[PDB]
Every structure is written in structure tokens, then in C-alpha cells.
Amino acid sequence: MFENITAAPADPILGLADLFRADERPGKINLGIGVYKDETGKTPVLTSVKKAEQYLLENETTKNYLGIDGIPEFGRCTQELLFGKGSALINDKRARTAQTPGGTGALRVAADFLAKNTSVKRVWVSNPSWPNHKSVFNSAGLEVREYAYYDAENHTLDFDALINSLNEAQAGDVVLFHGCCHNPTGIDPTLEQWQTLAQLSVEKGWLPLFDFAYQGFARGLEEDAEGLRAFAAMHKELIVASSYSKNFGLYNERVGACTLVAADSETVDRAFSQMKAAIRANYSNPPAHGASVVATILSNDALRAIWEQELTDMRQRIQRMRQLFVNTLQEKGANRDFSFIIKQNGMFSFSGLTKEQVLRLREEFGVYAVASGRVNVAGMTPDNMAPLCEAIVAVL
Amino acid sequence: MFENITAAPADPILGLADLFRADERPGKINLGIGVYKDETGKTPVLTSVKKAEQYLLENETTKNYLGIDGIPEFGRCTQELLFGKGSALINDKRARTAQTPGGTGALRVAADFLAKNTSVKRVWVSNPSWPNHKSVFNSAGLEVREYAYYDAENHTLDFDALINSLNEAQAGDVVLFHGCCHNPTGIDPTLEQWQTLAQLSVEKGWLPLFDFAYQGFARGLEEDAEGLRAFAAMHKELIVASSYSKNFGLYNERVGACTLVAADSETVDRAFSQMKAAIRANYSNPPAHGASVVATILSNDALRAIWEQELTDMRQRIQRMRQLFVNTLQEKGANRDFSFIIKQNGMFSFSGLTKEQVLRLREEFGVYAVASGRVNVAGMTPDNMAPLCEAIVAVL
Ligand SMILES: Cc1ncc(COP(=O)(O)O)c(CN[C@@H](C)C(=O)O)c1O
Numbered sequence: 170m171f172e173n174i175t176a177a178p179a180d181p182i183l184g185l186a187d188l189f190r191a192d193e194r195p196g197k198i199n200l201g202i203g204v205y206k207d208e209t210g211k212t213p214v215l216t217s218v219k220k221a222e223q224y225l226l227e228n229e230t231t232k233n234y235l236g237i238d239g240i241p242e243f244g245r246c247t248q249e250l251l252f253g254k255g256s257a258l259i260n261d262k263r264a265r266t267a268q269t270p271g272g273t274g275a276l277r278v279a280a281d282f283l284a285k286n287t288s289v290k291r292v293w294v295s296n297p298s299w300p301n302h303k304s305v306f307n308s309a310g311l312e313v314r315e316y317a318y319y320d321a322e323n324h325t326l327d328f329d330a331l332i333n334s335l336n337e338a339q340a341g342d343v344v345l346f347h348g349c350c351h352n353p354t355g356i357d358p359t360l361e362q363w364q365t366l367a368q369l370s371v372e373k374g375w376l377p378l379f380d381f382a383y384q385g386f387a388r389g390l391e392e393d394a395e396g397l398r399a400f401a402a403m404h405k406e407l408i409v410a411s412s413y414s415k416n417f418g419l420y421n422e423r424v425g426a427c428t429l430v431a432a433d434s435e436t437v438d439r440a441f442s443q444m445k446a447a448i449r450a451n452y453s454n455p456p457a458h459g460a461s462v463v464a465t466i467l468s469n470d471a472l473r474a475i476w477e478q479e480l481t482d483m484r485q486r487i488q489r490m491r492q493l494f495v496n497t498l499q500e501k502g503a504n505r506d507f508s509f510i511i512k513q514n515g516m517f518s519f520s521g522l523t524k525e526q527v528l529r530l531r532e533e534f535g536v537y538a539v540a541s542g543r544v545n546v547a548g549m550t551p552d553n554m555a556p557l558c559e560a561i562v563a564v565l
Numbered sequence: 566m567f568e569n570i571t572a573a574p575a576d577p578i579l580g581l582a583d584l585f586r587a588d589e590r591p592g593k594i595n596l597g598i599g600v601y602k603d604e605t606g607k608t609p610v611l612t613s614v615k616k617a618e619q620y621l622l623e624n625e626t627t628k629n630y631l632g633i634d635g636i637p638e639f640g641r642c643t644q645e646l647l648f649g650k651g652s653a654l655i656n657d658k659r660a661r662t663a664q665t666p667g668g669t670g671a672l673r674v675a676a677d678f679l680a681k682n683t684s685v686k687r688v689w690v691s692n693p694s695w696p697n698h699k700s701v702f703n704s705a706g707l708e709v710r711e712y713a714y715y716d717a718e719n720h721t722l723d724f725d726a727l728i729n730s731l732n733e734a735q736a737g738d739v740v741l742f743h744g745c746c747h748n749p750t751g752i753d754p755t756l757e758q759w760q761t762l763a764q765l766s767v768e769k770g771w772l773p774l775f776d777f778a779y780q781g782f783a784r785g786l787e788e789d790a791e792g793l794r795a796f797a798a799m800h801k802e803l804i805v806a807s808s809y810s811k812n813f814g815l816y817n818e819r820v821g822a823c824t825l826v827a828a829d830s831e832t833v834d835r836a837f838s839q840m841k842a843a844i845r846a847n848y849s850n851p852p853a854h855g856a857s858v859v860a861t862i863l864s865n866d867a868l869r870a871i872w873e874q875e876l877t878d879m880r881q882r883i884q885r886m887r888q889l890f891v892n893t894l895q896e897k898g899a900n901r902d903f904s905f906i907i908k909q910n911g912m913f914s915f916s917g918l919t920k921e922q923v924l925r926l927r928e929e930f931g932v933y934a935v936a937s938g939r940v941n942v943a944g945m946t947p948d949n950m951a952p953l954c955e956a957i958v959a960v961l
């Protein structure tokens with residue numbers, strides 16, 4: 170039955186990992202990671218989560234199944250994090266959250282629910298975007314269309330081409346927006362742009378689907394939710410898939426959520442039951458551990474206070490690396506201008522290097538980057554900055 | 566978009582939970598649980614896992630992502646558990662295991678891989694079976710057909726009707742077998758029956774799909790794998806989905822596996838890549854915690870020794886409850902014969918009660934059971950046995 174099965178293509182990001190871990194070169198740098206790293210080049214487990222894990226180890230009396238939608242406190246907590254502490258969506262109880270296996274798992278459940286309980290079949294994704302977005306939607310049987318976003322020349326959001334692209338989208342179509350820290354460009358709409366985007370969305374009848382994977386990595390927890398909150402107060406319905414992989418350093422515990430918002434409680438409840446049915450036919454119920462950690466931290470202020478400080482430390486380190494980067498390049502001399510790097514949020518950004526340049530960088534200097542020229546700023550340290558910038562200058 | 570969405574039907578097993586937790590009656594019993602319980606009526610976390618969790622808390626230095634297929638040791642360990650320590654399938658390296666979100670998650674990934682990488686479209690499931698089997702396969706777009714199994718009158722495996730049903734199945738069709746402790750009947754084929762089933766399977770060209778969720782709950786770890794091992798040595802290809810929810814009391818950590826076996830290494834590898842692609846488009850990578858716990862316990866003999874004792878204690882308690890049950894019934898007087906209960910393996914079995922009887926049992930005595938008359942033996946204790954049997958006798 171499997172004798173003629175075709176081998177799957179190598180993942181653009183994942184495949185690069187193995188080539189890196191084979192390059193025996195002394196002084197090699199990997200910027201195609203996609204995970205946060207500290208000044209030491211390590212992805213440590215947060216102290217606040219380590220504390221939350223001790224608490225659980227002492228307090229858990231059972232490992233009995235969670236409800237299809239996971240732990241209640243986790244749900245309530247994510248909602249307050251996303252829509253605001255005193256949000257109308259929360260008081261009118263128009264929202265329902267299901268704990269899921271990471272953000273990717275949240276997108277797949279949203280995809281299956283949508284594909285089986287509604288008239289949607291087209292999902293609009295930006296160009297470029299996280300490569301796995303297409304695969305997730307396609308596996309659900311949904312079609313993927315792309316709208317313009319990036320501006321190769323100015324290295325900015327091409328708002329006009331964006332609007333122009335979305336116009337061919339119809340009412341009943343899903344439009345996917347990155348909440349903040351756009352992957353792979355790091356270019357995010359300003360509040361005014363989010364606002365016009367929210368109005369256009371309401372007029373055209375789009376169904377907003379927010380992928381919120383980096384809350385707290387652009388400007389702050391609340392600031393980063395402005396866009397989502399703009400659509401939220403404007404729309405009767407929307408879906409938001411969130412991940413706690415980055416902001417909690419909980420990558421491998423698969424902790425995320427899928428929030429469903431409807432015009433009212435009666436309708437949101439009826440739609441949520443069908444979302445639970447989609448989960449039941451997938452993995453049954455979600456993994457408690459990582460979610461348990463998030464719920465205890467967010468519901469205790471001693472713990473939540475430590476966590477917030479640990480997050481701002483992470484955010485600030487990335488911002489310092491973008492600056493150190495521009496400086497060190499602009500210092501090691503070369504006709505160019507990487508000022509746009511300082512204007513971009515999060516861990517990623519397009520270095521503006523050509524396919525050949527990134528290939529030569531890898532082959533000749535041991536600097537590793539996604540073929541698209543996507544670079545992870547959190548993979549840079551005060552220590553590797555110089556040789557890194559020297560190699561880049563040598564390929565310009 | 567969600568304004569006309571239909572509410573999902575209540576799960577036959579899950580719905581009963583809420584009605585139970587509403588019945589304010591003093592002395593109510595719930596036999597529709599589907600989870601193991603000790604003499605106290607609690608689902609404790611095993612001491613061996615508690616020990617493994619302490620070890621992790623002290624040793625983990627990162628929460629960085631696992632590979633799409635999870636932790637290597639977990640995979641190797643499950644393979645030895647399933648196919649035998651010195652198995653040819655292991656030495657010839659014809660098998661590949663992916664850590665997944667529980668057994669249900671293993672079935673869904675097998676379903677998606679099958680539905681997208683092969684010519685299969687029909688899956689044969691026994692009648693009856695775990696209700697979620699159909700939903701999982703259907704969501705993948707596969708058709709579900711049922712083969713005869715139970716014998717309502719004799720309360721046994723109707724081997725002839727079974728064989729007779731499978732005959733209408735064609736080559737290239739998937740046939741689903743419960744490894745041991747058949748849900749909901751608890752009736753399992755004898756080794757001789759497994760053997761003829763394995764031969765017929767090879768002749769007809771079926772693709773075996775073993776759902777192995779209760780290894781260690783019928784007779785022992787190895788004994789319970791005899792059936793699977795019979796097919797394994799007979800087939801060039803097969804798929805096995807396993808769960809560690811019951812035998813490790815790790816219900817809510819979602820720990821399970823999907824083992825893919827092909828004629829050889831070269832082919833199994835090519836097919837596995839496509840299985841990893843199916844996972845990547847679902848939840849990306851698996852939750853480490855529960856799997857980490859299983860891998861450390863199974864790879865340390867101090868720990869593994871404690872775990873095995875804890876499992877035999879669980880197995881023996883269930884076996885004692887089936888006996889105490891037959892005795893107490895046959896003691897509280899009533900024309901019947903529940904001897905078949907002692908012949909069945911695992912936590913479940915059909916009590917042989919009518920729809921009305923189970924409804925009257927619930928309404929009039931507070932005894933709760935799945936409408937199908939499925940009863941969970943592990944929900945019985947020396948304490949509740951008498952009133953339980955008294956209520957049953959009163960509805961005969
Ligand atoms: C936009 C975006 N959405 C969702 C996710 C989902 O992540 P989790 O499922 O792990 O919660 C990621 C992770 N992107 C990483 C993996 C990368 O860009 O390399 C992401 O970049």
C-alpha cells in the first residue's frame with residue numbers, strides 16, 4: 170500500500186536545521202531558528218514557569234481528562250489577555266475559548282470547524298507569511314489566496330497593494346491577519362491602518378481570522394492587542410488563534426487557544442458545540458501541563474509579575490539586537506542601509522539578501538538563514554555580531 | 566456566518582457525565598466513566614509518574630520544540646513494548662513511530678495520512694466499538710463500514726458472523742482491530758482466532774490498523790500483544806495506534822503513538838515523511854511532558870519496576886471487581902447468569918441490560934450507565950457493590 174508513496178518535500182525552515190547540525194565549522198551562526206535565544210545562545214525555561222511547575226507537582230491529585238475545551242481558568246485568562254479586562258465581548262459573553270495544542274493546533278481546529286460548518290472555502294493569507302499557514306488550511310480542504318503586503322524596495326507595508334488585493338475577496342471569505350510581529354517581515358500595520366482595515370472588513374463582509382503568536386514581543390501585552398481590539402469592537406464575528414509558545418517559552422508543551430466570537434451568547438454557544446465536535450474527532454481533549462502552567466502564572470500576581478518582567482527582558486533583548494545589528498553593519502562599512510531593521514517588530518525580518526547571497530553566506534561563512542533571507546534577530550548576540558556583520562558585508 | 570449553525574449532538578458517553586453531576590441523590594453510582602478508579606473512587610496519579618515528574622522538573626533546561634515525531638527514546642520504547650524486545654521489525658528497522666496527542670490523536674494522523682497518501686477509502690470497524698472511531702475516520706473523509714463481532718445471546722465473539730462480514734471487504738481496505746480489552750464488550754479473540762484472522766487478512770489484502778489503548782489490562786504487557794505480534798510477523802505493512810492514558814494514568818497529558826510498518830526501511834522512511842507532513846499541518850509537534858514521563862520511566866528499571874507493579878495492581882483490582890460483581894448479584898438473588906462478566910477483559914463489558922432497564926436504573930436508583938448498557942467495572946468498589954447489585958436485581 171505504501172510501496173509507491175512519494176517522499177514529502179523538505180520544510181524550508183526545518184530542513185535548514187539538519188544542514189546546520191552537520192556543518193562542522195568553527196564559528197557558525199544559525200539565524201534560521203524561529204525560536205527565542207538569550208545572550209548565551211540558549212532557550213531556557215522561564216523561572217516563573219519553573220515555579221509554576223513546582224506548584225503543580227505538589228498540588229496535582231489526578232491526571233483525569235480535561236473537557237474538550239480544556240481548563241476554564243486558562244480560557245477566561247486568555248480572553249482577558251486578548252480583548253481587555255473589561256471588554257464587552259467578555260461581559261456579553263459572546264466569546265468561547267478552547268485550549269488547543271499550540272497555535273498551529275488552534276488554526277487547524279478553526280480550519281476544520283469552518284470547512285465543515287460554514288460556506289467558506291477561500292482563505293486569504295499575506296505574501297509572504299509563515300509557510301505552514303497554507304498547509305494547515307489546505308489540509309482542511311480550504312483554498313488559499315494571497316493578498317499583497319510587503320514592499321521589496323522600501324521594505325515596508327504596501328498598504329495600497331494590500332487594499333487592492335483584498336478587493337477581489339468576497340463576502341464570506343476568511344481573511345487572515347497576523348496580530349503583531351508579522352512573520353517573516355516584522356512589518357505591522359499602524360493603529361490607523363488597522364482601523365481602516367477593520368472598516369473595510371465590515372463593509373466587504375470578510376470573516377477575520379487573527380493569528381496571534383507573539384503577544385508581548387512588539388511593544389507590550391496590551392499595545393500589541395490594539396489591532397485585534399479594533400476589529401473586535403467592529404465585528405459581530407471573528408476567530409483568533411493564539412500561542413503561548415514564545416511569550417512563555419513553552420514551545421514543546423503545545424499550549425495555545427482558539428477563540429470564537431459570535432453576535433451573541435446563544436449563537437456563540439451553538440457554534441462552539443460544533444467546534445468541540447471538531448476537536449473530539451482530532452485529539453479528543455488538550456494536554457494539561459503547559460496550559461496548567463499558564464493558568465496558574467496568570468492567576469497569581471507574584472508569579473504573573475515575574476513572568477511579565479521576563480517577557481519585557483526578552484522583548485528588550487530583541488530590540489537591542491536589531492539596533493546593534495544596524496550599527497555594526499553601518500560600522501563595518503558597506504554601501505547599503507539597514508535602517509528598516511529598527512522599524513520592524515519581533516524576532517524576524519527580511520535581511521534583504523538575495524537567494525545567492527544567503528547561499529554564499531551559508532557555504533562560505535557558515536552563516537545560516539532561511540532561503541527567503543528571513544533572519545532571526547534573537548539568534549544574534551553581542552559576541553557573534555561582529556563576525557556575522559563581517560560575513561554579510563563580504564557578500565554585498 | 567455562524568447564525569444558522571446547528572448545535573452538535575450530545576456525546577453518548579460525555580453527556581451522561583453532566584446529568585450525573587446534577588443528580589443530587591445520596592448514594593449515586595457512576596459506571597459510565599471510561600476512566601480507571603481505585604477502591605476510593607479516585608483516579609490518582611501513579612507514584613512512578615510522580616517520581617518521573619520530579620526528575621524532569623530538576624533536569625529540564627529547555628522547552629524547545631520536539632521533532633515532528635516527538636522524542637526518540639519514547640519511540641524506541643513503544644516499539645519494544647508493542648513488537649517485542651528482539652523483534653525483527655525493530656532490527657530490520659521496518660517500523661517508524663511518531664509520538665502523538667493520545668491514542669485518538671494517533672488514529673486521526675493515521676486517518677489523514679491514509680486518506681491523502683493512498684487508495685483507501687473504506688475502514689471496517691466492529692459492531693459495536695468506541696463511538697469516536699467513526700467520527701475520527703469520517704472527519705478524514707474515509708468511509709466507515711461495520712463487521713459483526715458481538716453475540717447478544719451468548720455474550721461472546723461471533724467469530725463466524727465476523728469472518729462472514731469481513732468477506733465483503735476488499736483488498737486495499739483498512740480493517741480496525743482492538744488489540745486487547747475490546748471496548749465496549751471486553752470480548753477479545755483467542756490467540757488461535759487472531760492467527761486465523763492474520764492469515765485471512767494476508768489472503769484478502771486487508772491493511773490492519775490496530776487500536777491498542779489498554780496494553781496491560783487484560784493479562785499482562787506481553788500477553789496482550791500476542792494478537793498484534795501475530796499480524797506483525799505475518800504482514801509486510803500495518804499501522805498501530807497506541808495510548809498510554811490508561812496504563813500510565815496520563816489521561817490529560819495526551820500521550821500516545823502512531824507506529825507505521827512497511828516492507829522495508831527504504832519504503833517505511835518514504836511513507837513516514839508523508840506522515841510527518843500530516844502532523845505538521847495538524848498540531849506541528851507533540852506535547853513533551855506526558856511523553857517525557859513515559860520515556861524516563863520505561864528507560865530506568867527502578868522506575869519501570871514500580872510502574873509495572875502499579876499496573877498489575879490496577880489490572881488485579883478490575884478482575885476482582887468482575888468476580889465480586891458476579892458473586893454479589895448471584896447472591897442477592899435473581900434469575901439470570903452473569904458468568905460471562907468473568908470471561909471479559911478490561912474495564913468495560915455489556916451488562917446485558919435493556920435501554921429501559923438502564924434508564925430506570927438511572928432515574929429510580931441513581932445508578933448511571935451508558936445507554937448501550939456498557940458498564941465500567943473500575944467504577945465499582947467493595948463499598949458500593951451491594952446497593953449497586955440490589956438496584957440491578959430490582960430491574961430484572
Ligand atoms: C505566525 C505564526 N503563527 C503561529 C505559529 C504557531 O506556533 P505554535 O504552534 O508553536 O504555537 C508560529 C510559530 N512559527 C515558528 C515555528 C517559526 O516561525 O519558525 C508562527 O510564526
Ligand SMILES: Cc1ncc(COP(=O)(O)O)c(CN[C@@H](C)C(=O)O)c1O
Binds near residue numbers: 748807808810
Ligand atoms: C478503543 C479506544 N481506543 C482509543 C482510545 C483513545 O484514548 P486516548 O486518546 O485518551 O489515548 C480510547 C479511550 N476510550 C475512553 C475515553 C472511553 O472508552 O470512555 C478507547 O477506548
